[PDB]
Design a protein around this nucleic acid. Structure first.
Ligand code: MG
Ligand code: ZN
Lengths: 50, 51, 161, 101, 79, 189, 98, 50
DNA sequence: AAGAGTATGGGTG
DNA sequence: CCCATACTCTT
């Protein structure tokens, strides 16, 4: 956008991008939990073979 | 939609955070969900038995 | 591992500056740091600011001294205009610590170097400071000869001479 | 009560300089237009933090006021955050979204 | 002119000269008691000068010509 | 402190390639610099990019279309200006995009640019196998066939290059003295 | 903490430091380098003289600001005079020319 | 009462806070059951059994 | 009688 | 830790 259009459109675009990203990150509801860290089932057998 | 089974990119939260570049990296995910690995003594030598 | 001085002596200025730029960029690239090559080139240009006369010719120089390259070039072109024969020289390469210690201003030198040595040497030599650099004008609270102040200083040069 | 309206009038188009120590690459000082807020903390735009290397866990900043017309015009035309979009070191943009965006 | 000065920079051709020309015009409007050449929209003298510059109404040559004309008129009207 | 010194000197810019891997493309090393020589087409004698041209994005795309692998550019080291430099030997102002203006303190900018990433640097402590299809080129080569049916090079500064279909050096290697070459110069591999 | 004007040191004639003394913020060498890299000469000169230790310049700037005239008349910092006196006290003749 | 950004967990690798949050939720749930039993006056036998 | 090498001191963080 | 200088053994 900066290389094709210029400076002012780039500033406007950056502000709009920030606003949209914040709004949809809030809307998604993305969280972190203990069940998100999935351990592979073959870890124990690899450790045993080593 | 036809009732079959398909494989797609995961919507896992940690995977989404790492894949988009928002936060984290491969090594940190490996520490979280896989073995941490070999550690070094203060001089610099590698301890034979890893974590 | 070859030395930069031999690279400059045998191959030339372009070879040594290419060598230094390549080494620094190789060091910086391992960490994923992006730096343009202009900046290293201006640092290297600041490093190459002394020349050793090998032959005096029709000049007022010796044959074993080390002096500013700009003064040598100006004297050479002036003598060539006057029809006489200029001097021949070989470029030098100095570290940044040594290069910055050869400034021609005692206020600027005393600002950051060891103050006692600089002040003693300047007092013994009876030096005179023209206040041409940025740091000197910062010390006495004037406009720096750069940016929006640059034109101002030109007017000074327009009125002094 | 009238001095608050006077203050709102006198800061309408007067830039200020924000600086965070240590200053490393000239992007540690930038110019902004003030918006008067309640409280005791300075609000910072999320897209400039990477230039300041700043985060909101205890960092502090200093604010300076230009006085003369030349200083105000230098702040507007040279140091304004909308002029410093590309990096002086490599030419890449510095106001890049991160994390939540 | 309120958010960016790109047009004024293009018109003048240099940021460092733009600052000086704008400062001269702003001091004329603030202390010299002259009137702006653009409709004042509740702006400070600096912003008014920048908007005049980006409109093609103010540059160094124009200021010099106006100054010489006013000096000549004052000299004529002195007697 | 000046606009143009008029010098014809410069330095050669080529892609940075280490071993069999390409590290730095040409476009990232000539974007924003002023050409010190006319950029001629590899096949013809026609002038593609004239003398003293500021290589912006369009010129870089044009150069990559014609597969140019070396360009001579102006640098501040070989500048004729005394007590400063000129705008054309410096080139583009990276923070803005146009050419540099007179009166800018480029030394402070360079020092800050080098020193700012200093906190990301740590403070405390026998064969050549070509990976890509192409042709074998030899520089400073002195080869002879021995009684054992081996093409041994008697030169100690031989450089082995992989030339692609576009005349580019895909890979570069150092050939030690006493090596046995499977194929000669100009042979496709 | 904020400050417009206040008390100054007796020797250097510069604003004091600390919130307890109602002091000002330090504008060190790195900030000067940043201003030099920007090219803002008038901002730097104003920061160096009429804001810290130009005794006549401070008063003139305050009067002009109250009168609505945003212009300065910089002079010599007092610290440079102190430095000249200190160097002269060491038996060395240092002086200004013309 | 508080909203915290989940983006601060994965790179810092301080997973103790997630487990503490889960265990505090469980403890508050037990307390809620006890409070509900106390509000509607019940026998001491049921309270001590629970 | 020069010339290369070693012990001592200054300024720096 | 790095560089400059007075004193000592060698060709
Ligand atoms: Mg912090
Ligand atoms: Zn030049």
């Amino acid at each position: 956008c900066y290389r094709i259009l210029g400076l002012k459109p780039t500033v406007i675009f950056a502000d709009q991008i920030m606003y949209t990203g914040f709004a949809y990150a809030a809307r998604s509801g993305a969280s972190v939990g203990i069940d998100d860290m999935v351990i592979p089932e073959k870890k124990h057998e690899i450790i045993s073979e080593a | 939609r036809d009732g079959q089974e398909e494989k797609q990119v995961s919507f896992n939260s940690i995977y989404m955070m790492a894949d988009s570049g928002a936060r984290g990296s491969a090594a940190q995910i490996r520490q979280l969900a896989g073995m941490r690995g070999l550690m070094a003594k203060p001089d610099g030598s590698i301890i034979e038995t890893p974590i | 591992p070859e030395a930069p001085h031999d690279i400059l002596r045998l191959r030339g200025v372009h070879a040594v500056t290419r060598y230094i730029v390549n080494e620094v960029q190789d060091v910086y690239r391992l960490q994923g740091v992006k730096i343009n090559d202009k900046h290293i080139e201006v640092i290297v240009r600041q490093m190459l600011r002394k020349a050793t006369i090998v032959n005096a010719g029709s000049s007022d120089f010796l044959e074993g001294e080390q002096v500013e390259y700009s003064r040598v070039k100006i004297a050479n072109r002036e003598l060539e205009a006057n029809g006489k024969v200029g001097a021949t020289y070989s470029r030098d390469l100095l570290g940044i610590t040594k290069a910055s210690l050869a400034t021609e201003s005692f206020i600027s030198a005393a600002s950051f170097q060891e103050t006692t040595r600089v002040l003693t040497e300047a007092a013994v030599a009876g030096k005179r400071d023209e206040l041409r650099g940025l740091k000197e004008n910062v010390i006495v609270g004037r406009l720096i000869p750069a940016g929006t102040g640059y034109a101002y200083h030109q007017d000074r040069m327009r009125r002094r001479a | 009560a009238v001095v608050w309206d006077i203050l709102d009038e006198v800061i309408r188009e007067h830039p200020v300089l924000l600086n965070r120590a240590p200053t490393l690459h000239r992007l540690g000082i930038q110019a902004f237009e003030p918006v008067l807020i309640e409280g005791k903390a300075i609000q910072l735009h999320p897209l400039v933090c990477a230039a300041y290397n700043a985060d909101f866990d205890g960092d502090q900043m200093a604010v300076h006021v230009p006085l003369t017309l030349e200083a105000q015009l230098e702040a507007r035309a040279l140091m304004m955050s909308t002029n410093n979009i590309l990096s002086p070191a490599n030419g890449e943009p510095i106001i890049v979204p991160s994390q939540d965006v | 002119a309120r958010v960016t000065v790109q047009d004024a920079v293009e018109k003048i051709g240099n940021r460092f000269d733009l600052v000086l020309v704008a400062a001269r015009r702003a001091r004329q409007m603030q202390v010299g008691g002259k009137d702006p050449l653009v409709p004042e929209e509740n702006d400070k003298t600096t912003v008014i000068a920048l908007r005049e510059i980006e409109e093609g109404l103010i540059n160094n040559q124009i200021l010099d010509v106006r100054e010489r004309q006013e000096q000549q008129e004052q000299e004529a009207a002195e007697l | 402190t000046e606009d143009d010194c008029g010098t014809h000197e410069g330095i050669m810019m080529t892609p940075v390639i280490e071993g069999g891997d390409v590290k730095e493309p040409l476009r990232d090393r000539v974007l924003g610099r002023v050409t010190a020589e006319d950029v001629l087409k590899p096949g013809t004698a026609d002038i593609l990019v004239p003398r003293n041209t500021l290589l912006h994005e369009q010129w870089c795309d044009l150069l990559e279309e014609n597969s140019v692998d070396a360009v001579k550019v102006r640098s501040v080291v070989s500048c004729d200006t005394d007590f400063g430099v000129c705008a054309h030997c410096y080139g583009r102002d990276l923070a803005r995009g146009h050419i540099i203006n007179k009166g800018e303190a480029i030394g402070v900018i360079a020092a800050q640019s080098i020193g700012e990433p200093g906190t990301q640097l740590t403070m405390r402590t026998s064969s050549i196998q070509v990976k890509n299809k192409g042709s074998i080129k030899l520089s400073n080569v002195k080869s002879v066939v021995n009684s054992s049916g081996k093409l041994v090079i008697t030169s100690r500064n031989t450089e082995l290059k992989l030339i692609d279909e576009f005349g580019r050096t895909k890979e570069s290697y150092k050939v030690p003295y006493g090596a046995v070459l499977a194929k000669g110069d100009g042979e496709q591999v | 903490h904020a400050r417009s004007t206040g008390s100054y040191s007796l020797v250097t004639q510069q604003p004091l430091g600390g919130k307890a003394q109602f002091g000002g913020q330090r504008f060190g060498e790195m900030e000067v380098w940043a201003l030099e890299a920007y090219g803002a000469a008038y901002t730097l000169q104003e920061m160096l003289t009429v804001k810290s230790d130009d005794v006549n310049g401070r008063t003139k700037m305050y009067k002009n600001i109250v009168d609505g005239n945003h212009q300065m008349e910089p002079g010599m910092p007092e610290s440079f005079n102190v430095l000249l006196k200190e160097i002269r006290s060491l038996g060395i003749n240092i002086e200004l020319e013309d | 009462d508080i909203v915290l950004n989940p983006l601060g967990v994965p790179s810092r690798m301080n997973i103790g806070q997630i487990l503490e949050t889960h265990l505090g939720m469980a403890a508050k749930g037990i307390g809620d059951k006890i409070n509900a039993m106390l509000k509607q006056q019940q026998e001491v036998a049921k309270l001590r059994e629970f």
